[PDB]
């Protein structure tokens, strides 16, 4: 299924700190952030997505249209400019962020009743699993 709508509550988090370090996020921010449970809220209507990543320490939102390139500032994550594109590879939602960092982006897919995602930067991969609330 390509339907990723919902409020998703984190069940599992692996190598979140490696991903943050590959983005050069500072020590203090990483050490606090790696401890935290995350929520992902996805509003999906056709190609149009609104995605919100939250914890007690951040609230990061992005809107996009599948298949439409968009210039993006990554704001309080790592304050960089990238050229972003989100597309479907089968039922995997794939984001590529072109810019200073190699292999930067993410992948999301539904597997069972859960949302799985990969966050990638450089040679680091963070793997997460969320349950639908
Ligand atoms: C589809 C998933 C997305 C866009 C994200 C998953 C995690 C994100 C994130 C983590 C940490 C921060 N800060 C500010 C530490 C921001 C966003 S976005």
Author numbering: 1 to 133
From the paper:
Human cellular retinol binding protein II (hCRBPII) was used as a protein engineering platform to rationally regulate absorptive and emissive properties of a covalently bound fluorogenic dye. We demonstrate the binding of a thio-dapoxyl analog via formation of a protonated imine between an active site lysine residue and the chromophore’s aldehyde. Previously, we showed the utility of human cellular retinol-binding protein II (hCRBPII) mutants as a fluorophoric tag, wherein an active site lysine residue (Q108K) reacts with synthetic aldehydic chromophores, giving rise to the formation of either an imine (Schiff base, SB) or an iminium (protonated SB, PSB). Q108K functions as the active-site lysine and forms a Schiff base with the aldehyde, whereas the K40L mutation is assumed to eliminate interactions between Q108K and Lys40, an interaction that could otherwise impede imine formation, and is also required to promote Schiff base protonation.
Introduction of acidic residues near the iminium should localize the positive charge on the iminium, resulting in a blue-shift of the absorption/emission of the protein/TD-1V complex. Our prior experience with these proteins also informed our decision to maintain the K40L mutant for stability concerns, and thus we pivoted our strategy by incorporating acidic residues into the previously red-shifted template M14. Subsequently, we mutated Leu117 to both Asp and Glu, resulting in a distinct, blue-shifted iminium (M22–M23). Nonetheless, we did observe a discernible pattern in the quantum yields of mutants featuring acidic residues proximal to the iminium moiety. Interestingly, these mutants exhibited higher quantum yields, most greater than 30%. We attribute this to the propensity for salt-bridge formation between acidic residues and the iminium, which putatively would lead to increased rigidity of the bound chromophore, and thus reduced vibrational freedom, which in turn would reduce nonradiative relaxation pathways. Additionally, it is expressed solely in its monomeric form. Importantly, there was no apparent background fluorescence in the red channel, signifying that TD-1V specifically labels the intended lysine residue without reacting with off-target amines.
